[PDB]
RNA sequence: UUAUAUACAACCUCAACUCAUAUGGGACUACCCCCUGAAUUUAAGCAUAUUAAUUAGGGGAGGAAAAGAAACUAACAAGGAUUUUCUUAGUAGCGGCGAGCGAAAAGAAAACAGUUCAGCACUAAGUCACUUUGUCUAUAUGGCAAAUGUGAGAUGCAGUG
RNA sequence: AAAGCAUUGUGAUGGCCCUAGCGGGUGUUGACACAAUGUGAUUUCUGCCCAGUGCUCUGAAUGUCAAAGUGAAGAAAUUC
RNA sequence: AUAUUAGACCUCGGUUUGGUAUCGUCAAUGAAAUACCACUACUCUUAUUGUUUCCUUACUUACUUGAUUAAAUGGAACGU
């Protein structure tokens, strides 16, 4: 299935710019601080996991 | 089994596989009637777990309802009263669109009981629902003792009385504290109690 | 534009190798109406005469339904999994061809949910498995398996990526196919 | 873009690095590098954390250190390969030198001792405030636990201006199992030695000189 | 088959019938459930408030109905579905903080009854409705069996849970 | 009231009006029409005033300036 | 140090031994003393996938509208 827009709109805000803005944009799409923190830690877990298996 | 994948697949409603599936299923079901028979349940994972079985006669009907608040039907010679009374265009029903959905099916089909209802699509002016409905005088709904409760007479038009799962939520029924004042039942059972004025014999 | 889980179906196992699929799956039809309980009147001699375990003689046939075949692949008891392209809504099949790859089971998609239903003696069958491999006919099962695997299992890296649908059609492509006639010919007849 | 005598597009398993007994064609052994990069952390101000990759192993490092002492260094160290300089041959190092055709700054890092705070702040102005070879008593060596093992593979970081450090992480005179031994020790020690740090780093790219840089996950 | 030129099939979505069988509207008003919703009044004026989450209007049932076996309390030495009475209590709160309004836990009673699904490695559709034929014994939308005849059912029926 | 006179809007995905909502009237209409108003047959004329108010103008763009969006500070609420 | 090379080693190149080689790692003299060697940066150039008071053009499949008793629409073809 892949991601929704607001996951892909914040995966690109997680590779570069302002992890504090990956938690203002996720606290508007969810929107609580406890669910934003739980999703920013699981998009940034398959950001790094696909940083493994995109090559090999 | 398959039935557990369908539960998660259908949670991905903002995806791309499951956006261009209930894209093509809101411009089929809106090129037909307001109220419509269905040969299947279109989501047979949510149909069961609401009560549907694949037994004759369990029956599914689609509706659509019109997605907004309630314009107050005052005559454009609008509401005469004190200024708290003047609201027309920003008021909301107390029953939801799903509540009112299976209400509109229970009337038009008086020979069948409404069990439960379920969202299948929506876009901007019409949410629409399947409704699991049951032919209660069938010789297989009545002879089979699991479903057999709704063949009784306290289940005549339950969906018009707040007794299906959708009509139930409008009422405000729970435990404990937050759900306090409908505490005898209804909400009006509770005003009757809380305002009940017992003169006693021995008093 | 169709998102590339759709379509896998419709890359559905073109005719000359899916004709020998049902040449094989004609031997593992589940039941026959009289022959199910003709076998259960061959249990009546076990009531008084046989006095042993003679009439079972372990079965081997296909497994229908989609909730059954999901737990033939999650245990890897399944050796060949047939799916159906024309399933509605889609979701009772949409998880399946990715899971036959994640569990490594050679899957195929055939044309027909009525095609499979008429071999399980019912209306529409939606998907199947094959837990059995029975030894006398593993040869023609053999080169079915890899011939199924090339376009379904080894292709699961662009099947995950490439699908468009997206046809323009049919007087709209015919309108601009006059424009690519003329815009080309304006600088193809540019010399005079 | 990157040679694959050490694989990097094929990502790394621990089972593949022990093939590297057949890595080296060369007999002579020079340095492979500690290369740390402190971005998001500016060290030019007082922002400074002081740790060392404390190796329990000896990957054979190729160099020399001259040290100090005024009744403070070698009352214990004459069984510890030492000289006990009387600590004021340091203007032997500041604009005087050891000899012609080898410099006095030709060492690893220097010794902030106990009697020589008389000498530190500006008298090392054109000697060691100029040079950059001077740590403090943060050195993890004042002849206390690791004197020769300071010279032999335990040395800390005093940082580059453009944040590109090059000192010894190890060498190419390792065994076939020592490639998974140096970073195997910092799986607990430098995970929070980075001060005030959730994870402000990712660049862990151990450079070799006789090969491509070993890049880590 | 499908130059839409011979059939053939099977599904799927939908039709039609003075087809077989059935089901539903309407009444009552005291109580009951779902809705919609005022103004007189009081505030010594009056708009929020009050009246009132009420009169009136609409719909749906039963001899009761609704509710109901915890996404509940508490902060204990802990209690344990629902509903009714007593007390909490005209209290906490709410309010042009004005007029006014206003519950609940605990405690004491009456009564007490508990459960079922969906979703798993149930591990041979193991289920159901018709119809006909034997054949029971209400004037039986019954009882059993046979044909397992025709269908529902693998887009998931039973049992376990 | 009228006939005459004048002004206004409208070329239709329009003007005007109804409608709770769907939808309708004018409309079996189409500027010599439909709709909105003032004056009141003919004759003779209908002066000056756009300061106030109303109506109006692609048009004046930055004095004002909504929610949404965007940026920053903070552990967040949130404030700028 | 490597490069190179013949011999010990290897089936051989190759390793090794030694010779030769560019500033140098070091001197001079300072604000870094720079061999043998890398994790790279700002003016820019590429090449693959990125907030917006973004911007213009184009498409059809949502949707809107008209017309028809839903009859000849879009392409080619010969014959002139």
The string of DSSP letters for chain B reads: -HHHHHHHHTT-TTSSTTTSSSSTTTSSTTSS-SSEEESS-SSHHHHTTTT--SSTTEEEEE--B--S-------SS---SSGGG---SS---SS-HHHHHHHHHHTT-TTSEEEEEEEEEEETTEEEEEEEEE-TTSTTTSSSTTTGGGGSSS-TTGGGTT-SHHHHHTT---SSSTTTTS-SSSSHHHHHHHH-----S--
Estimate in Å the CA B64 to C1' F11 gap, whole number: 39
Q: Among residues B175, B26, B158, B23, which one has the least CA distance to residue B103?
A: B158
Q: Are B157 and B106 in contact (CB under 8 A)?
A: yes
Query: In chain D, which residue's Cα lies nearest the Cα of A51?
Result: D217
Size of interface B-C (CB pairs under 8 A): 47
Distance CA B9, CA A8 (A): 18
**Strand G nucleotides within 7 Å of a protein CB:** 1-3, 14-17, 25-41, 50, 59-63, 73-76
Contact B15 A4 (CB under 8 A): yes
Q: Are B10 and B29 in contact (CB under 8 A)?
A: no
Question: Which residues 9-38 on chain B approach chain A with CB closer than 8 angstroms?
Answer: 9, 12, 14-18
Cβ of residue B25 near strand E, that is under 7 Å? no
Closest approach of chain C CAs to the CA of B13, in angstroms? 12
Contact B16 A2 (CB under 8 A): yes
Contact A56 D10 (CB under 8 A): yes
Cβ of residue C174 near strand G, that is under 7 Å? yes
Q: Are B102 and B131 in contact (CB under 8 A)?
A: yes
Estimate in Å the CA B6 to C1' F2 gap, whole number: 81
Contact A55 D9 (CB under 8 A): yes
Give the rounded distance of the alpha carbon of A4 from its chain centre. Answer: 11
Q: Are D59 and D153 in contact (CB under 8 A)?
A: yes
Estimate in Å the CA B133 to C1' E32 gap, whole number: 25
Residues in A closer than 8 angstroms to D10, CB to CB, are 55-56
Resolution in A: 3.0
Helix axes C15-24, C139-152, angle to 10 degrees: 140
Distance CA B21, CA B183 (A): 44
Distance CA C67, CA C52 (A): 35
Give the rounded distance of the alpha carbon of C163 from its chain centre. Answer: 19
Other CB atoms within a 10 A radius of the CB of residue B103 amount to: 22
Query: In chain C, which residue's Cα lies nearest the Cα of B17?
Result: C3
Q: What is the DSSP string of D35-56?
A: -----SS--SSS---------S
Contact A55 D217 (CB under 8 A): no
**Quick check: helix, strand or coil at residue C137?**
helix
Among partner residues B2, B17, B20, which is closest to C67 by beta-carbon distance? B2
Residues in B closer than 8 angstroms to A3, CB to CB, are 15
For the CA atoms of chain B, what is the radius of gyration? 21
Estimate in Å the CA C31 to C1' E125 gap, whole number: 11
Q: How was this structure determined?
A: cryo-EM
How is residue A55 written in tokens? 């090559």
Distance CA C145, CA C191 (A): 59
Task: Read off the DSSP letter of residue D29.
Answer: -
Say what the alpha-carbon torsion angle B80, B82, B86, B92 is, to the nearest 10 degrees. Answer: -110
The answer to whether D9 faces chain A, any CB pair under 8 Å, is yes
- Burial of D106 by CB count in 10 Å (0-12 exposed, 13-18 middle, 19+ buried)? middle
Residues in C closer than 8 angstroms to B4, CB to CB, are 70
Task: Read off the DSSP letter of residue D128.
Answer: I
Residues in A closer than 8 angstroms to B9, CB to CB, are 1
Q: Are B147 and B134 in contact (CB under 8 A)?
A: yes
How is residue B107 written in tokens? 């009337």
Residues in C closer than 8 angstroms to B16, CB to CB, are 3
Which nucleotide is nearest, taking the CA of residue B37 and each C1'?
Answer: E14
**Quick check: helix, strand or coil at residue D99?**
strand
Cβ of residue C44 near strand E, that is under 7 Å? no
Size of interface A-B (CB pairs under 8 A): 15
Q: State phi, psi for B134 to the nearest 5 degrees.
A: -135, 130
Residues in A closer than 8 angstroms to B17, CB to CB, are 1-2
Among partner residues B9, B14, B18, which is closest to A5 by beta-carbon distance? B14
Distance CA B163, CA D132 (A): 82
Which nucleotide is nearest, taking the CA of residue B52 and each C1'?
Answer: E118
Question: Which residues 10-69 on chain D approach chain A with CB closer than 8 angstroms?
Answer: 10-11
Which chains touch A (3+ CB pairs under 8 A)? B, D
The answer to whether A20 faces chain D, any CB pair under 8 Å, is no
Q: Are D87 and D70 in contact (CB under 8 A)?
A: yes
For the CA atoms of chain C, what is the radius of gyration? 24
Residues in B closer than 8 angstroms to C5, CB to CB, are 17
């Amino acid at each position: 299935v892949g991601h929704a827009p607001y996951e892909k709109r914040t995966m690109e805000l997680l590779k570069v710019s302002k992890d504090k803005r990956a938690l203002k944009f996720l606290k508007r799409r969810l929107g609580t601080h406890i669910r934003a923190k739980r999703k920013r830690e699981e998009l940034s877990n398959i950001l790094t996991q696909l940083r493994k298996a995109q090559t090999h | 089994g398959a039935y557990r994948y369908m539960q998660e697949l259908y949670r991905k409603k903002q995806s791309d596989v499951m956006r261009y599936l209930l894209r093509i299923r809101v411009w089929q079901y809106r090129q037909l009637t307001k109220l419509h028979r269905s040969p299947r349940p279109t989501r047979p994972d949510k149909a069961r777990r609401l009560g549907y079985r694949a037994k004759q006669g369990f029956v599914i009907y689609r509706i659509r309802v019109r997605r907004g608040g309630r314009k107050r039907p005052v005559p454009k010679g609008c509401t005469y009263g004190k200024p708290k009374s003047h609201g027309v265009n920003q008021l909301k029903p107390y029953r939801g669109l799903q509540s009112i959905a299976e209400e509109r099916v229970g009337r038009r089909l008086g020979g069948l009981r409404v069990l439960n209802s379920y969202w299948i699509a929506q876009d901007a002016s019409y949410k629409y629902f399947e409704v699991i409905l049951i032919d209660t005088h069938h010789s297989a709904i009545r002879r089979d003792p699991k479903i057999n409760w709704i063949c009784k007479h306290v289940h005549k038009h339950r969906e018009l009385r707040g007794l299906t799962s959708a009509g139930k939520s409008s009422r405000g029924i729970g435990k404990g504290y937050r759900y306090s004042q409908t505490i005898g039942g209804s909400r009006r059972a509770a005003w009757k109690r809380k305002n009940r004025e017992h003169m006693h014999r021995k008093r | 534009k169709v998102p590339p889980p759709i379509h896998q179906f419709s890359q559905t196992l073109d005719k000359t190798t899916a004709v020998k699929l049902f040449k094989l799956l004609e031997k593992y039809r589940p039941e026959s109406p009289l022959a199910k309980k003709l076998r259960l009147k061959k249990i009546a001699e076990a009531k008084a005469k046989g006095k042993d375990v003679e009439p079972k003689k372990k079965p081997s046939y296909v497994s229908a339904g989609t909730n059954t075949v999901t737990k033939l692949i999650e245990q890897k008891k399944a050796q060949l999994v047939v799916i159906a392209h024309d399933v509605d809504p889609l979701e009772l099949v949409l998880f399946l061809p990715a899971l036959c790859r994640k569990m490594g089971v050679p899957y195929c998609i055939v044309k027909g949910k009525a095609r499979l239903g008429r071999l399980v003696r019912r209306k529409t069958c939606t998907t199947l498995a094959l837990t059995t491999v029975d030894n006398n006919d593993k040869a023609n099962f053999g080169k079915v398996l890899e011939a199924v695997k090339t376009n379904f299992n080894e292709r699961h890296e662009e099947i995950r990526r490439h699908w468009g649908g997206g046809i323009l059609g049919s007087k709209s492509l015919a309108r601009i196919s006059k424009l690519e006639r003329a815009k080309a010919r304006e600088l193809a007849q540019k010399q005079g | 873009m990157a040679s694959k005598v050490s694989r990097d597009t094929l990502y790394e398993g621990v089972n593949g690095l022990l093939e590297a007994s057949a890595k080296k064609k060369r007999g002579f052994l020079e340095t492979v590098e500690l290369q740390i990069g402190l971005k998001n952390y500016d060290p030019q101000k007082d922002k400074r954390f002081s740790g060392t990759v404390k190796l329990k192993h000896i990957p054979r490092p190729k160099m020399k250190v001259c040290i100090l002492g005024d009744q403070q260094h070698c009352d214990e160290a004459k069984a510890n390969n030492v000289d006990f300089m009387d600590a004021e041959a340091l203007k032997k190092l500041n604009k005087n030198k050891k000899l012609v055709k080898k410099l006095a700054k030709s060492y690893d890092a220097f010794l902030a001792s106990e009697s020589l705070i008389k000498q530190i702040p500006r008298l090392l102005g054109p000697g060691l405030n100029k040079a950059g070879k001077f740590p403090a008593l943060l050195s993890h060596q004042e002849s206390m636990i690791g004197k020769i093992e300071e010279v032999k593979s335990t040395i800390k970081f005093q940082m580059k201006k453009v944040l590109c450090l090059s000192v010894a992480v190890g060498h190419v005179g390792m065994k076939s199992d020592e490639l998974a031994q140096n970073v195997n020790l910092s799986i607990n020690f430098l995970v929070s030695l980075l001060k005030k740090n959730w994870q402000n780093v990712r660049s862990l790219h151990v450079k070799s000189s006789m090969g491509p840089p070993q890049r880590l996950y």
